[PDB]
Structure formats: C-alpha cells, structure tokens
C-alpha cells in the first residue's frame, strides 16, 4: 500500500530488506528523507551503500529526523550521540534492542566504517511474518499474553512487561514482540509452559523464510525499525570491525489487554526448568 | 555375589530398593548390622518398617557404624546435633544426589518420617549403576574420560566441585553415573552447548522408571540409602505437615578414570548462548 | 471395605472384597471408588472363575473380543497379556485411535516375578487442571487425531483434547504419547511442541501412582481419564488375564477453529529428530 | 586470473571474469582450485551457456548422472521446476552408497527476490566440536535412508569423512537423509544428531546466495549441506548437472553396531506427528 518509486530499490529477500541506490545522505532533502522513511516502513531494514565520509553533523541530523537520539559504550570524540560498535571493544544472539526497558528504541542507523571483506554479516528477521505464520489458535492465544523482558548485569538492572503481540503504530499491522536475548518469560503462564512456548517461537520467528543476511561493504549504512525486527551479528571473523551508530529512542510496545491475570505461584514454589542450562558461563 | 539370607527381604523393583522385615534397630547386634550393610550394597536403598520410638543414642550409634556424622545450620534434636529435623513447613521436587557441589559429598543418609499423611510425599530413588550400564558402549567410553562441575550459589552457601562423570563404588568396584539434575552444572571437557545436550539426555535416561523405585512412607519407617550410587526425588503432591529425623554420614570421594582430555578453553569474550530456553526470573 | 490410597493423585487398594460372588450393592461401592480413585486394586483374588470374571466385566458394559491377542481357551472375552507370547513401556490410553475407545479394563496378573513389571497410572484430570488458565482455555477448543498404522490394523479417530467425563462432569486431558498423532487446528510443528510439553507434564510423578503386582491382585481402571505405563524391568514370565469394557465416546467442546489447512506440496519438517528406522 | 569475492568467512565465493562457454583447461584448473578452497562457487552472467559446453564442463569433474525431465537430446541436463520443493538441510543423495561428488546448477527463470539457497561448511561443523566429541564421532557410522513411492535406498557412511583431495575431515550427517548412528541406541542417536544438525548449520558456518538470471552455482557435495529457502510463489526453473562417484571414507568404526534385544521397541524421546500433510 505504501508507494516508493523515487529511488532504485533492490530487495534482499521476500521477507525483508532492501538496498537503496541513488541516495546521498550527506545533504539529503526533506522529500528524499520522507521516501526513505516510507521504504523503512515497507522493508523493515534498508541499506544505503557508498556513504563513506558522512559527516558527524549530518549523521546526527539524519537520526534526529526520526526522533530523539540516545546518549549511551564508547562514543565518537565530540559526539555523545554517535556510539562506537568496535570488535576490539559482537552480539551473535537473536535480539530486539533494549526490550528490557519500558521504552525500547524505535530504530537505529549503523555504518560499518572498517571491516573484513567477508565475515561479520548481520541478519534481520520480520516479526510481522513470524506472527502471521502462526496458526489461528496460537495467534489468538498470544494476542492475550504479555512477557517480562529483563537484564541483570553489573551497572544495569532493568525489566519491563510488554505485549507478546504488538501493533506497529504507523502501519497498524501486528508483530511478534519476543526475542531470545532479552525476553524472560510469559507472565500469564507458569515458567515451564512459558519455556516451551518461547522455545518454539524463538526458532520459528528466525526461520530463514523470515530473514535476510547483509554483507557489509565499507561505507554501507543500515537503518532498521526496532519495533518489528530482530537481528543477529554473525561472529565469524577475527579482523577489526568498527561501526558508528545512532539510536532513535521512544518506542512504546502496545497491543491487546491481556485476557488473563499473571500466573501466581504458591508460597515456596520452585522453578525446575525442563531443559538443561549450565550454571556457569565462560 | 553378596549373600543376604538372615532377614525377610521384599524388593521394591528390579532396579533397587528393599523392605527389610524382622529387624529391630534399637539394640541391633554387630552381626545384624553387617547384614543390613550388605543389603544396602546390594539394594542401594533399604526400608525398615515399624521402628517407632527408636532412641536418639541408638540412632546416632547406628549412623556411626557407617562413618562420621554431619553436625550443623539446620534444626536438630535437643542434645544431638547429629539428628537433623526435616520439616515441610521449613522442599523441591528435583532429581538429585546429596551435596555433590561439595568435594566430599555424604556417603549416605538414614531418614525416618515421623509426621505425615497416609498418602502423599513419596520418595523415589534411582540406580546410577544401571543408568551407566544402560548406555551403549561408545557413550560409556566417552563418559569414562569426562568430569563435571557441580555447584550451588544461594544466600549463605557458595560451593563447587569437580567430579568424574563415572565413578567407581569403593566397596563394590562397580561403575555408576555421577551426574544429577539438581547440582551438576556442566561437563568440563565439552563446550557448554555440547554439555547441555549430553546432560539433558543423561538426566532423562538415568531416571527412567526401569531404573527407579517409589516408596510410600508409613509412620515408623526408616530409609537408609547409599548416596554414592543413587539419585532421589521427593514427590510434591501434599499439603499436610511432614516431619522427619535425619542422620547424614559424611565422607565420599567420588573417583574414576583420569580424564582423557583437557578442560574446554573458551576464547576471550566468548559468550554462552543456551540452545534451550530457561526463564531469567524464578518464583 | 478398607480403602488404602496409593498416592494423593490416584489409586487405591481395596481390602475385604471377594469378587467371585460380589453382591450388587458391593459392586456399587467399587464403582463409586473407581470414580473417586480412577484405578483401584483388589488383592487376594486367586482362583477367580472365568464365568465370574466375565459377569463382573459385563456389569460395566459390553466386553471386547480381541482378534490378535490370545484369549483364554473357551472364553473369547478373556484376553491374555503374556510376556512370552508378546510388554508396553510407553505412556498410553487404550485404543484411542478408535472412535470409541474402551471405557476401562479389569486386569489380573496371575503369574509374575516378586519384583519387576510394575504398572503406573496417571490422573488426566490433574494434568489438565495443573495447566495455567490461558492454556486450559486453548486446549478446550482443540481436537487431536489419534492413529495406528500396522499390518492388519489401520485406524484413526479425532477426539477433543479436553474431554468431559460423563459421570463426574470433570474435565480431563485426552492426549497420550503412544497413540496421539497431532492437534488438528495447529500446524504440525506447533502441535509437536505443545504435545511434547503435555506428554511430559501429564506424567509428572505428582500425577501418577506405581503398583507392584502380587499374584492374584486385580486392577480396575477408568480408561476415560487415565494413562498407564507397563515398566519393562523384568525377564521372568509374566501373565495376566484381562477383560476390556467397550463403549467410550469421548466428548468435549466444539472446536473453536477449523482444521489447519496446508498449501499444495507443503512439507512437514519436524523440529526434533526421530530415527527413520526402528529395531 | 579472476576476480574472487568471498560471501562469508565460512564458504562461498563469486567469481567474476569467467566465461564458461569456451573455458580453457588452465582456467578450469583455477575454478577447481577455488572450489576446493571455497566449497561452493558462483559464476554470474553466463546466460546462453550452450548445452554441449555445460556437459563438457560437468564431465571435467567426473561421470554425469543420466536419470526428472531433461533438455532435448541431453539426458545429463536435468530440468528443476518449482511447479514440478522442501526447505530442509541436506547433502544430496546420501541414502546411496555413492552419493554425488557435486553439482552445477543454473537458475534460468526466477523472481528478483526469494528462493535463496544456503550452503554450510561441514569441515567447520566438525572442527568446531570439542576434542572428546570429535574423538567419538571419528569412530561412528550412520545409516542414511529414503523410503518413498518408487525409491527405497539405504547406505552406511562414516560420521566423519576425509575429503579425498584436501585430506581434511568433515561432518557427514544431514537432517534430510541421515536416519541414525549405527553404534548407539536410537535414543542416544536422536540426541546426538539433534545437536549436530543445529550446530552444523549455525550462521557462522553458512552462506546465503541470491540467484540472478544467468548465475551458475558449483558445489562440492562431499563437504557441504544446502537448503532451499521456501519464501516464494513465482515460477522457478533451473538446469542442473550432477557429478557422480563419491565414496565417503573415514575411520574404521571403533565399536560394533548396537544390537537391540528381541521385542525391543524404539520410543522416541521427542514428538513427531504420525501423519504429514
Ligand atoms: O554489529 C552489528 O552488525 C549489529 C550490532 C547490533 O546488534 C546493534 O547495532 O544494535
Ligand atoms: O523428604 C524426602 O523424602 C527426601 C528428602 C531428601 O532429599 C533428603 O533427606 O536428602
Ligand atoms: O501389563 C500391564 O501392567 C498393563 C498392560 C496394558 O497396557 C493393558 O492391560 O492395557
Ligand atoms: O533450488 C535450489 O536452490 C536447491 C535445489 C537442490 O537442493 C539441488 O539442486 O540439489
Ligand atoms: Fe542490536
Ligand atoms: Fe536429598
Ligand atoms: Fe494398556
Ligand atoms: Fe540438493
Ligand atoms: Na514438565
Ligand atoms: Na547450537
């Protein structure tokens, strides 16, 4: 339904992703930006090649066309809004950014400025298709559920409850809103039922039929909508890999009112996972 | 190869467990004790009914025939730090071998349920000899060369220990699996993802019903089990008050083959991403 | 009668019964106990006559005349369960691949070892009730296909995932590992994941009992709301006599969704490995 | 000689500056070298490649399969048509005693996006296992089988095979066609194969190729798996030549086959439906 005829557009896969040719971000016009925004709502992640030398001031202004920018992670000297993604300073797990926060980012703009000629691909997945591919009884179940997303590390403790199925505010289409990295458990199920259901959803939602895989070339820029995607940074390289990122704040994942109360354990109830995880990491 | 003809013995299952009749623990003789010890090495867990009123001094002396007794943070009978009080009001249904997160787990325990319902609260035991012997030869060969880290991290108790995956029983010379769901963390020579897959298989296989027994407690019943070669599981199907008296015999050193490989070495920054979901937050 | 429950979940041993000439009023008490305890055990019934065994089964309904299993000579209704002549170490509910599974059975182990060969049963009411409310609500609206495909026997049937016991009105899970194939309104991969969870949860030790057979003991169980499992831990000869009561018609809610419809050429690729060849 | 653009660290490379139609013996040697290095290579812009040249090219690698519809007068050139697919990781025909050593595939009709093919590096799948597990697998074999109307075949192959040219060891099991490991019981086999299948197709071991008109893919079936993504509805047609003659070879097994007892039954620990679609 969204018309996007200005630039030359090369889709990556049927599910999502498109490379946009004929764009120069440095001095982009308002009209050209509006077209990129429509392409982002259509393709969920878009790639802008050959943008070497993009000035810091233009990079920040571009991000601010989408919303307020986050101030984190190292940042570019003189620009707290430009975050540094440096392999010498890696994320090979499917995730949606910062969903342990009540208001995750709406999206990001990432440019790999130094990297290997091969290795270090990034994958994205289409959470609309992950929801739409579930059968009707399961979609109906998930519409009424919420999940807790959490992180507990030194210096960062956060948790948030979000609908399992969210509407995109600017398309009105429903998308799965759970991810392996940050989702803990479904709130209305007991933990063992939650484990079983999330295990299925994590695998199904990152099926190759729902993903794209991008090979970075120096100067390439990726822009993605964090509301309706997951992504994964492939850890297949030893070379130095360095990226500049701006992160657009302000999502509020919203869906149906939950149709059941939170699961209430009895006093002293213990969670015994059905599947083994080690007690100690590396 | 162990002869045990003195008492009336009623085995529970083919795998393990036997109820011993005609026994009075209160003033047991040395000869009768030697027979009970043989029955324990043969049957792994034995049950002695009708022992209501067993005196504290006699219970302690009985335990001490097996080894040194644990004394400790846990309520105990007045004047007897060795006799622990177990109380449902002060419980987790999970297969475990006692305290394998310690370098020296207990040899075994003697437990008598003194208050409880007529049904509910059964305890199951499993035979870790059969769990190992039931694995095919390539897998037994693999496990013989592996060790595993066992650990616990709770308020006031932090402990870990590395044990052979396959231990020999020092007094029978027979080999037994030595991992359990509750306390084993990971196999040391595998990466964590491989470890998870193998332990998941082993935990399920080792508690197959063909390797277990299930005991219904009656007032006065005493259970004595060998912690070197069993797991056990407390069924959580009751709400009534449940109270027991327990003595714990210290002094195991799980021993097996020298490991055939070095510990797995992760690279700097390497991250463990489990293949199977566990929740981040419990109850 | 003196009634001794086995576990909180189900099962009770009944002393003081003589099945051979049981009165109509004593039978009514056994029936009440069966609805309360789901499986009941009657010890000390050695020598129970064939005619009395058949009359007892017929108090519950029509008895099955099996085609494959041997039967006691002269009595097509008394089936033989013999370890030499054939064991079933898999959780199952009897014949759920049929549109009308049995409503229960009466089994007596007449010869067996002093240990080994226990049978376990599970309580499918508690299996359903132990699910959280969103999942109970989901299952209430689903059905499942149960099937068997062997030489000489080919049968499938569609049953509610949650059935209402006709006498008690209480809801019970009605899927089992051995004979359930898939949930009809989900795709096969979703079905696999949900059934895998249900199978393991439904046979949790908190929902089961385990019975050690003594020669002469009789078990009577309600096949509408139980599963059972025959432990395969013995090599000695084990022989039982069984009568099977026909006539279940599992009933539950109208499904809330249509069957899942694959597209032409769609392929089922299971998420979990099974071997392509058995033994 | 050529301009070589690798797809991922693990495997795959696109080769520019090639013309297959009249390729010289020396340029073919370079393609062969690149195939041993990159496991699957992609040759764009080969529209119009003649049937006689396509057959001669395949015959440089070995004998060609002559069994599917095919081009008029050329039973070696198989026609693959979506309208006449299953998304599953597989190595071709491993249910046969001598699976193909590789294939040459050109998509001639297809959509601009959709229908990618992924390949995985079975050397890295093996090498990424820890030493105790590599040691175990070295001594095992597996049965591969297929049972469909008109085709029943099974074969036993080493779980770890030595590539005859490179001498490097590669995993040799795949989800589609491997049944079970022969020296384990079936439940142990399921658990180990489940782990191996998922590990071996990790994204760090794979590449994903987007087909363009005229593109030719050449892959070594001895040390790869591949997967056809099922994300399209448009018509998709390819021309394929299959090179026969693998004999997967590895270590003598260190244990005998597992022997069940009479009457023993296999009860899988994980649910599969009894009926497909
Ligand atoms: O390094 C990458 O490709 C992506 C990193 C990432 O997860 C992010 O920028 O949010
Ligand atoms: O309470 C029981 O039945 C067993 C408790 C237990 O795990 C123990 O005493 O070590
Ligand atoms: O042999 C047993 O204990 C039970 C066998 C069985 O499944 C039956 O009788 O339906
Ligand atoms: O169509 C494809 O991309 C792959 C088909 C395939 O599996 C083969 O040609 O062997
Ligand atoms: Fe990210
Ligand atoms: Fe314990
Ligand atoms: Fe049965
Ligand atoms: Fe193929
Ligand atoms: Na469970
Ligand atoms: Na893995």
Q: CB of A225 within 8 A of CB of A96?
A: no
Site of tokens 């009768």:
B32
Helix (H, G, I), strand (E, B) or coil at A112: strand
Q: Show the tokens assigned to C222.
A: 């309600």
Between the CA of residue D226 and those of D92, D96, D105, what are the distances in Å?
Answer: 9, 17, 13
Q: CB of D180 within 8 A of CB of D143?
A: yes
The Cα angle at residue A253 between residues A251 and A254, in degrees rounded to 5: 135
Ligand 1 pocket test target in A63, A70, A73, A85 with most atoms within 8 Å of CB: A85
Q: Show the tokens assigned to D92.
A: 């071709």
Residue B125 C-alpha to ligand 5 middle, in angstroms? 47
Q: CB of A39 within 8 A of CB of A18?
A: yes
Q: How far apart are CA D256 and CA D251, in angstroms?
A: 13
Q: Show the tokens assigned to A24.
A: 């120069």
Domain containing D221 equals: 3-244
Residue A133 lies in a domain: yes
Q: How far apart are CA D193 and CA D191, in angstroms?
A: 6
- Tell me which residue of D83, D209, D105 sits closest to A13, measured CA to CA: D209
Tell me how crowded residue C192 is: count the other CB atoms within 10 A of its CB: 22
Which ligand is in closest contact with the Cα of B113? 2
Q: Which residues contact D108 (CB under 8 A, 6 or more apart)?
A: D213, D237, D238, D239
Q: CB of D16 within 8 A of CB of D5?
A: yes
Between the CA of residue A70 and those of A52, A80, A159, B152, what are the distances in Å?
Answer: 23, 8, 19, 39
> CB within 6 Å of ligand 4 — which residues?
D 92, 103, 105, 117, 226, 228, 238, 240
| B281 with A93: Cβ contact below 8 A | no
Q: Show the tokens assigned to A185.
A: 């458990």
Resolution rounded to one decimal, in angstroms = 1.8
> Could you write out the three-class secondary structure of B141-200?
HHHHCCEEEEEEEECCEEEEEEEECEEECCCCCCEEECCCCCCEEEECCCCHHHHHHHHH
Residue C152 lies in a domain: yes
Interface B-D, measured as beta-carbon pairs within 8 A, has a size of: 60
The dihedral built from the CA positions of residue B217, B220, B226 and B227, taken in this order, carries a sign that is positive
DSSP letters spanning A37-91:
HHHHHHHSEEEE---TT--HHHHHHHHHHHSPBP----EETTEEEEEEEETT---
Q: CB of A257 within 8 A of CB of C183?
A: no
Q: Show the tokens assigned to D267.
A: 């009860």
Consecutive H or E run containing C2? strand C2-5
Q: How far apart are CA C19 and CA A39, in angstroms?
A: 80
Residue C55 lies in a domain: yes
Phi–psi pair at C137, nearest 5 degrees: -65, -40
Q: Whole-angstrom distance between the N-terminal and C-terminal Cα of chain D?
A: 50
Site of tokens 């009992």:
C209
Q: How far apart are CA B205 and CA B190, in angstroms?
A: 20
Q: How far apart are CA B76 and CA B71, in angstroms?
A: 9
Helix (H, G, I), strand (E, B) or coil at A34: helix
Chain breaks in chain D (C to N over 2.5 A) after: 67, 84
Which of B9, B11, B12, B14 to mutate to test binding with chain C, by most C CBs within 10 Å of its CB? B14
Q: CB of D269 within 8 A of CB of D187?
A: yes
Chain breaks in chain C (C to N over 2.5 A) after: 86
Q: What is the Cα D199 distance to its own chain's centre?
A: 16
Q: CB of C175 within 8 A of CB of C199?
A: yes
Helix (H, G, I), strand (E, B) or coil at D191: helix
Q: Is A22 left (phi over 0), alpha (psi -120 to 50) or beta?
A: left
Q: How far apart are CA D227 and CA D207, in angstroms?
A: 10
Q: CB of A93 within 8 A of CB of A181?
A: yes
Tell me how crowded residue D139 is: count the other CB atoms within 10 A of its CB: 19
Between the CA of residue D129 and those of D124, D192, D226, what are the distances in Å?
Answer: 9, 12, 20
Q: CB of D53 within 8 A of CB of D22?
A: yes
CATH of the domain at A23: 3.60.130.10
Phi–psi pair at B24, nearest 5 degrees: -120, 110
A48: Cα within 13 Å, side-chain hemisphere: 25
Cβ–Cβ contact D171 with B under 8 A: no
Consecutive H or E run containing A30? helix A30-43
| DSSP strand pairing (A45-48 vs A18-21) | parallel
Q: How far apart are CA A268 and CA A166, in angstroms?
A: 34
Q: How far apart are CA C43 and CA C215, in angstroms?
A: 8
Residue C38 lies in a domain: yes
Residue B258 lies in a domain: no
Consecutive H or E run containing A149? strand A146-153
Residue C133 lies in a domain: yes
Chain breaks in chain B (C to N over 2.5 A) after: 72, 90
The dihedral built from the CA positions of residue B16, B17, B23 and B24, taken in this order, carries a sign that is positive
Q: How far apart are CA B205 and CA D129, in angstroms?
A: 23
Q: How far apart are CA D226 and CA D90, in angstroms?
A: 6
Site of tokens 């959490």:
A150
Q: CB of D89 within 8 A of CB of D191?
A: no
Q: How many domains does chain D have?
A: 1
Q: How far apart are CA B194 and CA B191, in angstroms?
A: 5
Cβ–Cβ contact D127 with A under 8 A: no
DSSP letters spanning C77-118:
TSEEEESS-----S-B-TTTTSSS--SEEEEEEEE--SSS--
Q: Whole-angstrom distance between the N-terminal and C-terminal Cα of chain C?
A: 47
Structure determined via = X-ray
Q: Is A166 a known active-site residue?
A: no
Q: How far apart are CA A192 and CA A102, in angstroms?
A: 25
Q: How far apart are CA B269 and CA B138, in angstroms?
A: 33
Give the active site residues of D: 90, 92, 226, 240
């Amino acid at each position: 339904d969204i018309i996007t005829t200005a630039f030359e557009v090369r889709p990556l896969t049927s599910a999502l992703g498109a490379e946009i040719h004929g764009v120069r971000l440095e001095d982009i016009t308002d009209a050209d930006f509006a077209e990129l925004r429509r392409l982002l709502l259509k393709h969920l992640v878009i790639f802008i090649p050959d943008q070497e030398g993009w000035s810091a001031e233009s990079r920040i202004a571009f991000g601010r066309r989408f919303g307020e920018l986050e101030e984190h992670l190292p940042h570019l000297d003189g620009h707290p809004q430009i975050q540094i993604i440096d392999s010498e300073q890696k994320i090979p797990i499917w995730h949606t950014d910062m969903t342990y926060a009540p208001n995750p980012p709406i999206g990001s703009v990432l440019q790999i400025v130094d990297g290997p000629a091969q290795g270090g691909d990034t994958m994205w997945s289409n959470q609309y298709l992950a929801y739409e591919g579930l059968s009707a009884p399961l979609r109906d179940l998930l519409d009424g559920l919420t999940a807790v997303h959490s992180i507990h590390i030194p210096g960062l403790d956060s948790q948030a409850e979000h609908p399992v199925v969210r509407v995109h505010p600017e398309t009105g289409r429903r998308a799965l809103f759970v991810n392996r990295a940050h989702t803990s458990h479904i709130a209305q199920l007991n933990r063992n039922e939650s484990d079983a259901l999330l295990q299925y959803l994590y695998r199904f939602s990152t099926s190759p039929e729902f993903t794209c895989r991008y090979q970075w070339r120096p100067g390439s820029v990726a822009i993605w909508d964090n509301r309706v995607t997951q992504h994964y940074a492939v850890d297949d390289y030893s070379e130095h890999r360095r990226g500049l990122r701006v992160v657009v704040l302000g999502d509020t994942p919203s869906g149906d009112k939950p149709r059941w109360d939170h699961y209430r354990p009895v006093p002293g109830q213990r969670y015994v996972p059905d599947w083994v995880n080690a007690k100690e990491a590396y």
